[PDB]
Amino acid sequence: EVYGIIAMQAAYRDYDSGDAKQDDNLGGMQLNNESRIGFRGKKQFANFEPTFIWQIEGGYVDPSFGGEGAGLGERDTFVGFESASWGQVRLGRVLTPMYELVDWPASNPGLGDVYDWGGAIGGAKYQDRQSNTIRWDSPMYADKFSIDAAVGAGDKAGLGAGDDYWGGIAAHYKLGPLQLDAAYEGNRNIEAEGQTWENNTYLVGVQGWFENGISFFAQYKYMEADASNGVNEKQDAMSAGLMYTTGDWQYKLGYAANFDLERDGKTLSNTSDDVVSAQIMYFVDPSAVLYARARMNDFNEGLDGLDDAARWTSGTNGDYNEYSVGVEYYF
Amino acid sequence: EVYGIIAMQAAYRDYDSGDAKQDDNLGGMQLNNESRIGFRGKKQFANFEPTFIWQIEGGYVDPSFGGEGAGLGERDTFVGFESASWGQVRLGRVLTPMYELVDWPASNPGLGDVYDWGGAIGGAKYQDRQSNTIRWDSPMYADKFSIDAAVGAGDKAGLGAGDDYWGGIAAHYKLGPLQLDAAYEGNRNIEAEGQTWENNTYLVGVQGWFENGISFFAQYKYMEADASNGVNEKQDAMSAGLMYTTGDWQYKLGYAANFDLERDGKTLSNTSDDVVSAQIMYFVDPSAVLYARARMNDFNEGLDGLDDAARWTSGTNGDYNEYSVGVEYYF
Amino acid sequence: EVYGIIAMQAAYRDYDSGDAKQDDNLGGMQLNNESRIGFRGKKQFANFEPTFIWQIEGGYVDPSFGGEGAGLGERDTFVGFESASWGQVRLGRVLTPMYELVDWPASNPGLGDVYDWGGAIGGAKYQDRQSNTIRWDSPMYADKFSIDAAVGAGDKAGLGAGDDYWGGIAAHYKLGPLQLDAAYEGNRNIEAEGQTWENNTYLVGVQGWFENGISFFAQYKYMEADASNGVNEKQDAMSAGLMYTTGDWQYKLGYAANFDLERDGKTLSNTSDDVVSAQIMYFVDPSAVLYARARMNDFNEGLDGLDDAARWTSGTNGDYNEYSVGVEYYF
Ligand SMILES: [Mg+2]
Ligand SMILES: [Mg+2]
Ligand SMILES: [Mg+2]
Ligand code: NA
Ligand code: NA
Ligand code: NA
Ligand code: NA
Ligand code: NA
Ligand code: NA
Ligand code: NA
Ligand code: NA
Ligand code: NA
Ligand code: NA
Ligand code: NA
Ligand code: NA
């Protein structure tokens, strides 16, 4: 089976970095082509009862700020087995249990700069899509409770260049119109800024869908990092979204924030970020949507790593607003 | 739906750069594999009259002078909408209206070193296939007149690294056995050789296909560029082709040339290129062709840009002749 | 048609390089995803009797020690023609006749570090998968005898950076349960270590499949190299595998070795490698296999090239053992 998500966002950005030429370079109108094509299949082996599953998914073919061209396997690409009793196991490149909740619902619409890869903690707060991963997905026990658990090699280890690794777990419980979400991830042996780090990240959240057309989500996220020289860091964060759906339309407000980072008990000032976002979406077909989106990113003002050099954050390139229209079509 | 052009040229080149070791490296037999796989489709949205269209086309999988392997999205890759009243609008990565006519008919057979990316003018005479583009293609009004128009982001703007942009327009009129072609492209905020450039390129052409088996194309291209320091540059060029088609055979002579560049009113000597090409093509199948081809490229002898450094042209590597056989098949 | 091999090997390696941090870096658990997607087809041209053939095969989507993503055209990618009287001719990226026998059977299971790309001779003992190649595959004359022959450009020449080339031939003869194999490859104008090299490799080998469930292979490989400064080098090598297949199971022991390199008649001590490997395989489906594998790599201890610099070998990263399980599925 060939599948695909055809997705195209025309997005205008207006940057306020403090440098006008940089604002000219980063800002302006671009096309964010997140179209991808993938291949997947099942096969029932004659001599093995768990059903074989597999997927090979290409990357974004032309994202904004990037060149054309994606290879096959850049996104979720795996093999596995699935049973009605124990759910499914996947080996390969997949989303960590924590990141899947960070990405959805908590990064939509355009909150990712702050809540996905945003933040200021050292080490690696969590992986997102990670290769060299084994991931178990429980079935939805009693149609209300499921578990996601995974471990895998780190980024450096996947190149034979390190021994970083990570493990994570997430749970979901359905309670009436609500879903409750909790997740953990632990990153070990993370090499950065001349230190070896350990990261621990905890997430709790809630999601609601109501028959009057309101739906919403709220998430709290707590990140701790410990470096080998004794330094401890802490940063937490939140994301929330409110939606109203009526006929063929969805109205959505979203907000997400990282709070000031605390190093060794001391709060580093102006190390917070937040983003406010408004979106109108049109259900143009059961297989497609049209959307318009406007958002505002106010980033942190800078921070040094443990090597006395500037640590990179999603605010390094400066504050910016964004206006966009987009289409996404699934097949 | 999956489509493809299976394209294979076995090409022998004999260079004459003036350095025998460089002739040895650059010359010799190679296999130019321009085979490409693509994906496309349409979708009539329930709630939108213009039909949704999309395409994702992979690159040349193993061209000569390049390593193996191509990603999806390297060639024309877009979304868009179409309607019989107002035509087609495409967003993503497409051919500029000007470049399309430069490429076909005027670059065939093997005239592209001179007429396509050949030239000496500064800035960017035109884009060829460009991401971050919106392109309107009109219906063929009265089955005779159509309009291609496009604006897009520049090469550097595509990476958040600059603020270049461009706009282009082309028109075609069918008149008996003739087609009349005209095209403009203007490139802006082009950063090169220490300056910011504006380019203006104009093209006029004719094509004819006659019942006696003769067909032909002839084009004139006018390139002007102006630099931020006041320097003005001008270069013009021609391409022409003559075909005789009898039964399953087509014989073809092509010729193209860039004439001497003029900078601030003064002609720069020996800045011209020309190419003379001969080809025989066999219609081996309604879906495929075989061909043999020989061509002479005599390039310019060098020029400097406005940074007092050598400006790269397609002649930088030296003159060369080329004899080749090829196969193209379409599905 | 779309076809694929879905291949996943979870491999744990334990290195003994003599550097504990390198051992931690190179070793540990990885996922080796060699899943690959391809496209192939034939076409009967209306005006040409030999059937047109073509294939475009993608790379490994996520191999161990490598990043995710592969393009189309990274594995066997070609056009060609086939007729019954004379076999098939392919043009493009294919395996050389010598390499095809090195790889299968003589590299399985996991012998490749030693027998495939392993070794210490200078220049280029042979290509493996090579672009810019023309390869003829004879039919099986008298239902017992076939021939493979090929000529191609070199690694450098396919980028326009040299004039290396190569040619190769192989022959197979069926003798009851046996197949006899022989092959030759010659490489020319190989530029390495300040010299230009000529390589000559010869291979003889036997495969047998007996109805008792016993099968085996045994190969002897002889490698000669001549540098432009007069230096001669010689190294030979061996690969053997023993298999017992009963029911849905295949047991396998393999062994391969490169022996000490001789330079100008003098044996260079400790320039040998060998590998011993055991494997159990389960025919889980007519389309798929599960396997478990353990192997031990004992690599050479270093040598200099003719430029007084260390010559890279598959032992440069140091000795290692490896334990793994895998699935391969074909569609
Ligand atoms: Mg990662
Ligand atoms: Mg461009
Ligand atoms: Mg090679
Ligand atoms: Na810009
Ligand atoms: Na892009
Ligand atoms: Na799950
Ligand atoms: Na060459
Ligand atoms: Na190539
Ligand atoms: Na048009
Ligand atoms: Na060890
Ligand atoms: Na490691
Ligand atoms: Na990998
Ligand atoms: Na063969
Ligand atoms: Na020894
Ligand atoms: Na060793």
Q: How would DSSP label each residue in C26-47? A: H-EEEEEE--EEEEEEEE--TT
DSSP assignments along A298-321, one per residue: E-----B-TTSSBPP-TTTT-EEE
Measure CB to CB from residue C45 to each of B2, B72, B284 and give the nearest one. B284
> Omega into B50 within 30° of 0, i.e. cis?
no
What ligand has the least distance to the C-alpha of C82? Answer: 13
| Per-residue b or e along A111-131, where b marks 16 or more CB atoms closer than 10 Å to that residue's CB | bbbbbbebbbbbbbbbbebbb
Maximum Cα–Cα distance across chain B: 66
| Per-residue b or e along B84-96, where b marks 16 or more CB atoms closer than 10 Å to that residue's CB | eeebbbbbbbbbb
Q: Cα angle vertex A152, ends A147, A154, to 5°?
A: 135
CA of C155 to the centre of ligand 3 (A): 5
Rounded to whole angstroms, the Cα distance separating B308 from A283 reads 57
CA-closest candidate to residue A226, choices A192, A254, A181, A202: A192
Q: Phi and psi for B243 in degrees, rounded to 5?
A: -130, 140
**B276 half-sphere exposure, CB direction, 13 A CA radius:** 1
CB contact under 8 A, B163 and A28: yes
- Chains linked to C by 3 or more Cβ pairs within 8 Å: A, B
Contact B30, B65 (CB under 8 A): yes
Burial group, residue A305, by CB count within 10 angstroms (0-12, 13-18, 19+): middle
Measure CB to CB from residue A72 to each of C8, C61, C284 and give the nearest one. C61
The reported resolution of this PDB entry, expressed in Å, is 2.5
The alpha carbon dihedral of A172, A95, A115, B157 has a sign of: negative
- According to DSSP, the residues that pair with C207 across neighbouring strands are C179, C217
What ligand has the least distance to the C-alpha of C260? Answer: 14
- According to DSSP, the residues that pair with B16 across neighbouring strands are B319
Strands, DSSP E only, in C210-272? Answer: 214-227, 232-246, 249-258, 261-263, 266-268
For chain C, the straight-line distance linking the first and the last C-alpha, in angstroms and rounded, comes to: 10
Please give the structure tokens belonging to residue A174.
């359905």
Residues 6+ apart with CB under 8 A from B115: B102, B106, B107, B221, B237, B239, B256, B258, B275
| Per-residue b or e along A146-174, where b marks 16 or more CB atoms closer than 10 Å to that residue's CB | bbbbbbbbbbbbbbbebbbbbebbbbbee
CB contact under 8 A, B92 and A62: yes
CA dist list (Å): C158 to B25, B28, B64, B161, C164: 9, 9, 6, 32, 9
Measure CB to CB from residue C79 to each of B6, B26, B65 and give the nearest one. B6
Give residue B114's identity as a one-letter amino acid code: V
- According to DSSP, the residues that pair with A92 across neighbouring strands are A78, A133
Q: Name every chain A residue with its beta carbon within 8 A of the beta carbon of B56.
A: 4, 35, 37, 61
Residues 6+ apart with CB under 8 A from C104: none
What ligand has the least distance to the C-alpha of A94? Answer: 1
Rounded to whole angstroms, the Cα distance separating C134 from C94 reads 8
> Omega into A50 within 30° of 0, i.e. cis?
no
Contact B208, B178 (CB under 8 A): yes
CA of A260 to the centre of ligand 12 (A): 36
Please give the structure tokens belonging to residue A269.
């000032």
Q: Name every chain B residue with its beta carbon within 8 A of the beta carbon of C157.
A: 25, 28, 30
Q: Name every chain B residue with its beta carbon within 8 A of the beta carbon of A316.
A: none
CA of B26 to the centre of ligand 7 (A): 5
Q: Which long-range contacts (CB under 8 A, 24 or more apart) does A259-267 make?
A: A259/A235, A260/A235, A261/A120, A261/A121, A261/A233, A261/A234, A261/A235, A261/A303, A262/A233, A262/A234, A262/A235, A263/A231, A263/A232, A263/A233, A264/A231, A264/A232, A264/A233, A265/A232
**In the 8-state DSSP scheme, what is residue B10?**
E
**In the 8-state DSSP scheme, what is residue C72?**
B
CB contact under 8 A, A285 and B47: yes
CA dist list (Å): B85 to A190, B50, B88: 59, 10, 9
Residues of chain B with a CB closer than 8 angstroms to some CB in chain A: 2, 39, 41, 43, 45-48, 52, 54, 56, 59, 69-74, 77-79, 91-93, 131-134, 153, 156-163
What ligand has the least distance to the C-alpha of C299? Answer: 15
Measure CB to CB from residue C30 to each of A48, A54, A158 and give the nearest one. A158
CA-closest candidate to residue B245, choices B206, B280, B205, B294: B280
> Omega into A109 within 30° of 0, i.e. cis?
yes
CA of A63 to the centre of ligand 5 (A): 4
- A22 sits in which H/E element: helix A20-26
Domain assignments of chain B as residue spans, ordered by start: 1-331
Strands, DSSP E only, in C47-164? Answer: 51-57, 77-83, 87-95, 129-137, 145-153
Residues 6+ apart with CB under 8 A from C159: B65, B66, B67
Burial group, residue B283, by CB count within 10 angstroms (0-12, 13-18, 19+): middle
Please give the structure tokens belonging to residue C211.
């109805």
Q: Name every chain A residue with its beta carbon within 8 A of the beta carbon of C28.
A: 153, 157, 163, 165
Q: Tally C-beta pairs within 8 A across A and B.
A: 120
Contact B295, B321 (CB under 8 A): yes
CB contact under 8 A, A4 and B39: yes
Measure CB to CB from residue C70 to each of A2, A45, A72 and give the nearest one. A72
User: Which residue in B has a C-alpha nearest to residue A288's C-alpha?
Assistant: B45
Q: Name every chain A residue with its beta carbon within 8 A of the beta carbon of C2.
A: 2, 39
Measure CB to CB from residue B161 to each of A25, A62, A286 and give the nearest one. A25
Contact A314, A114 (CB under 8 A): yes
Rounded to whole angstroms, the Cα distance separating C115 from C100 reads 12
Rounded to whole angstroms, the Cα distance separating C93 from B33 reads 9
CA of C101 to the centre of ligand 13 (A): 11
- Chains linked to A by 3 or more Cβ pairs within 8 Å: B, C
Contact B110, B325 (CB under 8 A): no
Maximum Cα–Cα distance across chain A: 66
Helix, strand, coil % in chain B, rounded to nearest 5? 5, 60, 35
CA dihedral A298, A304, A310, A313 (to 10 degrees): -30
Q: Phi and psi for C299 in degrees, rounded to 5?
A: -95, 165
| Other Cβ atoms closer than 10 A to C79 | 23
Rounded to whole angstroms, the Cα distance separating C189 from C124 reads 10
Q: Name every chain B residue with its beta carbon within 8 A of the beta carbon of A284.
A: 45-48
Please give the structure tokens belonging to residue C115.
């027998």
User: Which residue in A has a C-alpha nearest to residue C317's C-alpha?
Assistant: A160
CA-closest candidate to residue A240, choices A107, A99, A97, A128: A107
- According to DSSP, the residues that pair with A80 across neighbouring strands are A53, A90
Rounded to whole angstroms, the Cα distance separating B185 from B89 reads 18
CA-closest candidate to residue A197, choices A241, A235, A164: A164
CA-closest candidate to residue C1, choices B331, B285, A313: B331
What ligand has the least distance to the C-alpha of A130? Answer: 1
User: Which residue in C has a C-alpha nearest to residue A54's C-alpha?
Assistant: C6
Rounded to whole angstroms, the Cα distance separating C301 from C305 reads 14
CA-closest candidate to residue C9, choices C281, C317, C253: C281
CB contact under 8 A, A24 and B159: no
In the three-class reduction of DSSP (H, G, I as helix; E, B as strand; rest coil), residue B195 is classed as strand
CA-closest candidate to residue C93, choices A58, A154, B30, A293: B30
- Tokens 């290195």 sit at which residue? C15
For chain B, the straight-line distance linking the first and the last C-alpha, in angstroms and rounded, comes to: 11
Strands, DSSP E only, in A58-212? Answer: 77-83, 87-95, 129-137, 145-153, 165-175, 178-192, 195-209
The alpha carbon dihedral of B5, B8, B11, B17 has a sign of: positive
- According to DSSP, the residues that pair with A290 across neighbouring strands are A282, A327
CA of A141 to the centre of ligand 15 (A): 52
Rounded to whole angstroms, the Cα distance separating A94 from A92 reads 6
Q: Name every chain B residue with its beta carbon within 8 A of the beta carbon of A66.
A: 158-159
**In the 8-state DSSP scheme, what is residue B311?**
P
Rounded to whole angstroms, the Cα distance separating B245 from B231 reads 47
Question: CA of C39, closest CA in chain B: separation in Å?
Answer: 8
- According to DSSP, the residues that pair with C228 across neighbouring strands are none
| Other Cβ atoms closer than 10 A to A47 | 12
Rounded to whole angstroms, the Cα distance separating A62 from B130 reads 11
Please give the structure tokens belonging to residue B193.
């050789």
Contact A89, A136 (CB under 8 A): yes
**A31 half-sphere exposure, CB direction, 13 A CA radius:** 31
- B289 sits in which H/E element: strand B288-298
Q: Phi and psi for C25 in degrees, rounded to 5?
A: -75, -50
**B189 half-sphere exposure, CB direction, 13 A CA radius:** 17
CB contact under 8 A, B31 and C92: yes
CB contact under 8 A, C39 and B2: yes
- Tokens 């023993």 sit at which residue? C242
- Tokens 């001497």 sit at which residue? B260
CB contact under 8 A, A153 and C29: yes
- Tokens 């496009």 sit at which residue? B150
| Other Cβ atoms closer than 10 A to B117 | 14
| Per-residue b or e along B247-279, where b marks 16 or more CB atoms closer than 10 Å to that residue's CB | eeebebebbbbbbbbbbeeeebeebbbbbbbbb
Neighbours of ion ligand 13 (CB under 5 A): C 137, 146, 148
| Other Cβ atoms closer than 10 A to B51 | 15
- According to DSSP, the residues that pair with C40 across neighbouring strands are C55
- According to DSSP, the residues that pair with A38 across neighbouring strands are A3, A57
CA of C140 to the centre of ligand 8 (A): 31
Residues of chain A with a CB closer than 8 angstroms to some CB in chain C: 2, 39, 41, 43, 45-48, 52, 54, 56, 59, 69-74, 77, 79, 91-93, 131-134, 152-153, 156-163, 165
Q: Phi and psi for C103 in degrees, rounded to 5?
A: -70, -50
